[PDB]
A paper describes a structure:
Upon activation by RAS, RAF family kinases initiate signaling through the MAP kinase cascade to control cell growth, proliferation, and differentiation. Upon activation by RAS, RAFs phosphorylate their sole substrates MEK1/2, which then phosphorylate ERK1/2 (4, 5). Type II inhibitors bind (or induce) a conformation created by a crankshaft-like flip of the DFG segment that reorients the phenylalanine residue toward the ATP site. Here, we compare potency of type II inhibitors tovorafenib (TAK-580) and naporafenib (LHX254) in biochemical assays against the three RAF isoforms and describe crystal structures of both compounds in complex with BRAF.
The naporafenib structure and both tovorafenib structures contain two copies of the kinase in their asymmetric unit, arranged in the back-to-back configuration typical of the active BRAF dimer. In the BRAFV600E structure with tovorafenib, the inhibitor binds with its bisubstituted pyrimidine ring in the adenine-binding region of the ATP site, where it forms two hydrogen bonds to the kinase hinge (with the backbone amide and carbonyl groups of C532). The amide nitrogen on the left-hand side of the molecule hydrogen bonds with T529, and the central thiazole ring of the inhibitor is positioned between T529 and the active site lysine (K483). The adjacent carbonyl oxygen hydrogen bonds with the backbone amide of D594 in the DFG-motif, and the right-hand side amide nitrogen hydrogen bonds with E501 in the C-helix. Finally, the trifluoromethyl-substituted pyridine ring binds in the hydrophobic pocket vacated by the DFG phenylalanine (F595), with the trifluoromethyl group oriented toward the back of the pocket. An essentially identical binding mode is observed in the WT BRAF structure with tovorafenib. Density for the activation loops in both tovorafenib structures is not resolved between residues 599 to 613, which includes the site of the V600E mutation. Interestingly, for one subunit of the dimer in the tovorafenib BRAFWT structure, we observe formation of a domain-swapped dimer with an adjacent molecule in the crystal lattice (related by a crystallographic 2-fold axis of symmetry). The swapped region includes the αEF helix and flanking regions (residues 610–630) and appears to be facilitated by the unstructured activation loop, which leads into it. In BRAF, this effect appears to be an artifact of crystallization with the surface-mutagenized kinase, as all of the structures that exhibit the swap were determined with this approach.
Residue numbers in the entry:
A (entry chain B): 449 to 599, 611 to 722
B (entry chain A): 449 to 599, 612 to 723
Write the structure that this text describes.
């Protein structure tokens, strides 16, 4: 039972504010981060999202996954995790434009693959893996999490739903292969320093063209010192078909093998 | 269910042998440490000690406590934790040649109090807190555990409280016994030496401390030691258990002292 009684957490400075809840830096046996769900009376949808996100964080115990520490119910639905200093991988590659050596770029990819492999081993799909959700604790240790913001109908309405209405309410595209594709884009950001489709103006094109197998990230933007296995591993992780993308076991294996060759 | 099936962990080079079994550096979604009980037929006594140590490590989820990751039963009773680089606090203060600044010495005391408070909050008694069981992961993050051989001992007496020397059963182990152990750690941090370093043999240190006739020489503290620390150290080394403060009020004054130096 990881429930934290009301009165122990010392809510401090606010970190952000999303469509789900607000996040503060709290005091609880040290520095922690608390996502207070702005629900004085959570709806069953919001309550289920709370029980789902805590139920997933319970099964995680890894160096490269964000350390879950506890949750609260009174007087606000809250989730308490460790407090990490630094910035997100998106902030270092696309906002600050910090130059990482090729040694560290592979190390960040290795730790990310380590955390992702532990999730898939525990039968956990990230569903929203991106460089913004890859926090660099102390600018060294990679911490994977879901810092998201926007986190029944298939029952009483089923006798009247047309067949084509059921082609969109029983398909779950989120799978281990979808997380592999997300990891492939992260490899693109690490090895190119840019976001994919950087020459496209709007997102209306990027959505329809990528989903139809007509648009793929320009792999020629990789650095000159990029290892030839990284560009090949990146391409296999960005295959249009889901089955053609490799699994994280053999992904982490090739990255860790490349890491030991780089001194 | 944190049990790791047989065949996923790649046991590697032997590092040491602590607690019950020997400890190796293993491969399991990254670098991990595995303590395998090398007994093909463990006695129920050894099995119960295994079930107790995992039952306590399950209840731990803190930045300054060693991350438990899983256990094994086939073909050997094993415990899998994270793999941390660096050395123990005992190695840094009495073996290594580097002197830690007073800023970092207070930070090590803060992280130790943070981890110890989290243990006592979870109703967990360490029973054997000492600078040898305080690992400095990456020479920065303090990790508290029950190792044995991290990096003949003899001195494993110096952290036992006076009432712990008048043995009864499993009653002298209490939160006050761990507070006394923390006081000895404060002595090592603020003096750079072990307590009773001027005593020839161990025949005196055991009977004299247990009879309230021997206490660590507080005049051996450094000149730049804050006066708040010397008072907190003395109260943590009181002969009576009730006169020693609790880690809440211990961690409170340490973090309060830390913010006066960090700004
Ligand atoms: C309170 C807030 N903590 C911070 O924001 C924070 N923490 C450290 N350092 C900072 N600078 C900041 Cl700012 C958070 N509470 C829950 C968070 C979370 O990620 N849950 C989660 C994780 C997963 C994962 F398994 F993929 F990991 C999934 Cl699948 C689904 N949900 S994050
Ligand atoms: C597998 C082996 N790991 C290592 O040895 C190791 N790990 C990282 N880096 C290294 N260089 C090494 Cl060498 C371990 N398995 C269980 C360990 C342990 O401490 N259990 C424990 C913890 C507590 C606590 F609550 F106080 F935390 C208590 Cl009260 C009682 N028992 S340690």
């Amino acid at each position: 039972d990881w429930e934290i009684p009301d009165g122990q957490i010392t809510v401090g400075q606010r970190i952000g504010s999303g469509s789900f809840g607000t996040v503060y830096k709290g005091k609880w046996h040290g520095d922690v981060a608390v996502k207070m769900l702005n629900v004085t009376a959570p709806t069953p949808q919001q309550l289920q999202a709370f029980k789902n996100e805590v139920g997933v964080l319970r099964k995680t115990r890894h160096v490269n996954i964000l350390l879950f520490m506890g949750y609260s119910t009174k007087p606000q639905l809250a989730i308490v995790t460790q407090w990490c200093e630094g910035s997100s991988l998106y902030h270092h590659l696309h906002a600050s434009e910090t130059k990482f050596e090729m040694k560290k770029l592979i190390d960040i990819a290795r730790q990310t693959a380590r955390g992702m492999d532990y999730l898939h081993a525990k039968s956990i799909i990230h569903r929203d893996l991106k460089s913004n959700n890859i926090f660099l604790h102390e600018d060294n240790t990679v911490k994977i999490g879901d810092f998201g913001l926007a986190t029944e109908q298939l029952s009483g309405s089923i006798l009247w739903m047309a067949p084509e209405v059921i082609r969109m309410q029983d398909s779950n595209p989120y799978s281990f292969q979808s997380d592999v594709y997300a990891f492939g884009i992260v490899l693109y950001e690490l090895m190119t320093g840019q976001l994919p489709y950087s020459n496209i103006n709007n997102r209306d094109q990027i959505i329809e063209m990528v989903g139809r197998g007509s648009l793929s990230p320009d792999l020629s933007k990789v650095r000159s010192n990029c290892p030839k296995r990284m560009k090949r591993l990146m391409a296999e992780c960005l295959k249009k078909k889901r089955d053609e993308r490799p699994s994280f076991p053999r992904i982490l294996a090739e990255i860790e093998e490349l890491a030991r060759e780089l001194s």
